[PDB]
């Protein structure tokens, strides 16, 4: 390219896815361980380182593986896641590194715160370680951161690159643119891325715115078996895723594969 993846792959991626897842936791971151559961795977690684952171816171871481190786880173893412887513825113610115670128811121810131520390650780680881590888991764945111880282790383450069580192892633857313891417692819590294388916873261922112894313892718578609595718490228495419767218788925995210891522568971 596408493719488927493978396984591985896946496984890886798943691982890466865891760880893422683981881371867221817391333990581981931171813691840082592983511980938771798943871881483981892973655981093983180781770681190281973581961281977281214050511111932104972121966391994361690383580781490481070784064984695987690778290182790883992671891252986561936121925591819471758902818311962141728711718420877340883216720114852118740138970135840186590179340139142109751118991326946115925130892632850147977261890665830166861581980156540194880681890276360184790583590187430281790587160184150580380188081988390885690284990876890175985561997722979301973371992835875103992872891426840124890786780138850185690469870158630184160192070594790381591509290969190694990777890365992955897852878821893732883216860142830125383109460129860146592209750148881242370039680097390369690887890456992967893843886614788962558906997520938602890847894618843121837215595419438319520118931113774218790268890376590959893966895615797953588934589970079961598962498966894843892847695419591859890287870057972113368209195819896966894215495819458905618015448709877417937160748941797926967391886781891836299945675991858961874031938471852891």
Not at 54 to 74: C, F, H, P, Q, W
Not at 121 to 139: E, N, W
Request: glycine share 6%.
């Amino acid at each position: 390219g596408i493719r488927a993846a493978t396984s591985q792959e896946i496984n890886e991626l798943t691982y890466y896815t865891t760880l893422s897842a683981n881371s867221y936791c817391r333990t581981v971151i931171p813691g840082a361980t592983w511980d938771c559961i798943h871881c483981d795977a892973t655981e093983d690684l180781k770681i190281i380182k973581t961281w977281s952171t214050l511111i932104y816171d972121t966391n994361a871481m690383v580781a490481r593986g070784d064984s695987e190786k690778t290182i790883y880173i992671v891252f986561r893412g936121s925591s819471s896641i758902r818311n962141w887513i728711a718420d877340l825113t883216f720114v852118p610115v740138s970135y840186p590194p590179v340139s142109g670128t751118k991326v946115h811121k925130g892632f850147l810131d977261s890665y830166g715160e861581v980156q540194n520390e880681l890276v360184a650780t790583v590187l430281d680881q790587f160184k150580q370680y380188p081988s390885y590888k690284v990876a890175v991764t985561g997722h979301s945111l973371g992835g875103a951161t992872a891426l840124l880282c890786a780138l850185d790383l690469y870158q630184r450069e160192e070594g790381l690159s591509s290969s190694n580192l990777f890365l992955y892633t897852q878821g893732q857313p883216r860142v830125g643119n383109p460129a860146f891417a592209n750148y881242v692819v370039s680097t390369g590294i690887p890456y992967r891325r893843t886614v788962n388916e558906r997520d938602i873261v890847p894618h843121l922112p837215p595419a438319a715115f520118g931113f774218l894313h790268a890376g590959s892718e893966y895615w797953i578609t588934d589970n079961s078996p598962e498966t894843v595718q892847v695419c591859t490228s890287d870057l972113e495419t368209s195819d896966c895723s894215n495819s458905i767218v618015p448709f877417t788925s937160v748941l797926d995210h967391l886781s891836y594969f299945g675991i858961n891522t874031g938471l852891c568971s």
